[PDB]
Design a protein around this ligand. Structure first.
Ligand code: HEM
Ligand SMILES: O=C(O)c1ccc(-c2ccco2)cc1
Ligand SMILES: [Cl-]
Ligand SMILES: [Mg+2]
Length: 393
């Protein structure tokens, strides 16, 4: 009844161009079985959305990677938020929601916007730049560590640590095993910065520690919650901003619409998140036997969700393979859906918006002018190098 496929969604060929295989996965049925890894897969919007929105049946506390925490030891202590189910999830989630709240965005927006305008001005002096190292990486590095309250020294550990975290959700392939082999110095740095004395006053880390006297979290939970933001809040935004620049470089008509109405910047970024989906895949584990899209899945089974595929499913989206900055994007699953839906989404959207607003106001053209190179990770999609010429407005 359930079709069995040999597609390896963690292979380099798949990362190089996942879109044909994603259609094959959607069109094979609502639920497939991936023989390479002994997991169920869901690639259509409907089932991805259903799984995300039933956290009781499709839990997170057995891990959101391939590894089942009931069978193997987690590679690092479990996250108190991502790898927790309700009710243990609820109070840590509420703390991070308040630390990254609608109200908190008002304290950082002026500085984030000024940094984005300054970066675009600097890049325009050079003309030909690498939109990954020089923009997608450089901009979030220029704002997010400081907003966290991290010291300057050792920040070179942050992107390697995040790449490790996202590789470690995958299967025990070479990408994952090499990442873990190299991990000790990055883990050591990250764990140390999570302690209260190492986080500058007023930043996100200090604010998490301040919540430890409200009864929502205890002091010994705060370092792991700081760890969550250092894991999840940098490399994702690098790949989101890189995706947006790549979309504007490939679709110049949409750059022209964005220049003509810079208030489209926030939706242009949201559409890039749908179109490229920085976070491509991750897992749940069933807590009982369950019927999903007509298939029966037993207890204790890993279920792989294809978020990028859900975001391109023609059953849900008109012209899914077009980048359209005025699309009604509400309902895309690039930030997840339901109780775990990205708690950092307002930070991500703020960074993306202000960078795209700077480009909309300052840049007339974005032309790819060198070899584009992809960066490979078990669950993140993005580029290693994106040579572009920026022409000033
Ligand atoms: C474009 C950028 C981003 C993308 C595409 C993204 C994507 C996601 C997704 C898909 C999830 C849901 C995971 C799940 O359901 O298991 C998530 C959760 C989360 N994200 Fe993001 N994210 C981004 C930026 C950020 C930022 C800037 C931060 C923090 C400052 C952050 C922190 C978190 C945390 C802590 C969680 C766990 C939430 C929970 O389990 O309740 N993310 N993100
Ligand atoms: O709590 C953490 O350490 C954490 C939180 C979220 C993520 C993530 C996976 C997919 C999207 O976001 C990774 C790590
Ligand atoms: Cl760690
Ligand atoms: Mg069984």
């Amino acid at each position: 009844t359930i079709p069995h496929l040999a597609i390896d969604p963690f292979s380099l060929d798949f990362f190089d161009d996942p879109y044909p295989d994603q259609q094959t996965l959607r069109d094979a049925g609502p639920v497939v079985y991936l023989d390479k890894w002994n997991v169920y897969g869901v690639a259509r919007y409907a089932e991805v959305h259903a799984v995300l929105n039933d956290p009781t049946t499709f839990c997170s506390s057995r891990g959101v990677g391939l590894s089942d925490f009931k069978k193997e030891k987690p590679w690092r202590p479990p996250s108190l938020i991502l790898e927790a189910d309700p009710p243990a999830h609820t109070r840590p989630r509420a703390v991070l929601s308040k630390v990254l709240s609608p109200a908190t965005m008002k304290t950082i927006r002026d500085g984030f916007a000024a940094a984005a305008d300054a970066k675009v001005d600097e890049l325009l002096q050079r003309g030909c730049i690498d939109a990954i190292a020089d923009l997608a990486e450089a901009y979030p590095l220029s704002v997010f560590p400081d907003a966290m309250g991290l010291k300057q020294e050792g920040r070179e550990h942050l992107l390697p640590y995040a790449g490790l975290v996202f590789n470690a959700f995958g299967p025990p392939n070479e990408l994952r095993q090499t990442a873990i082999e190299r991990s000790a110095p990055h883990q050591a740095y990250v764990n140390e910065q999570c302690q209260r004395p190492n986080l500058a006053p007023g930043g996100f880390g200090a604010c998490i520690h301040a919540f430890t006297d409200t009864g929502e979290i205890t002091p010994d939970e705060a370092p792991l919650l700081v760890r969550s933001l250092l894991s999840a809040g940098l490399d994702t935004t690098v790949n989101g901003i890189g995706a947006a620049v790549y979309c504007l470089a490939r679709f110049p008509g949409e750059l022209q619409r964005l220049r003509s109405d810079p208030t489209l910047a926030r939706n242009a970024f949201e559409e890039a998140v749908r179109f490229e989906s920085p976070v491509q895949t991750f897992f749940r584990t069933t807590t009982r036997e369950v019927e999903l899209g007509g298939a029966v899945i037993g207890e204790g089974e890993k279920v792989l969700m294809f978020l990028g595929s859900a975001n391109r499913d023609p059953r849900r989206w008109s012209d899914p393979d077009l980048y359209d900055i005025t699309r009604k994007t509400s309902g895309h699953v690039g930030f997840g859906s339901g109780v775990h839906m990205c708690v950092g989404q307002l930070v991500a959207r703020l960074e993306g918006e202000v960078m795209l607003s700077a480009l909309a106001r300052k840049v007339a053209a974005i032309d790819i002018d060198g070899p584009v190179k992809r960066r490979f990770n078990n669950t993140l999609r993005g580029l290693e190098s994106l040579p572009v010429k920026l022409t000033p407005a």
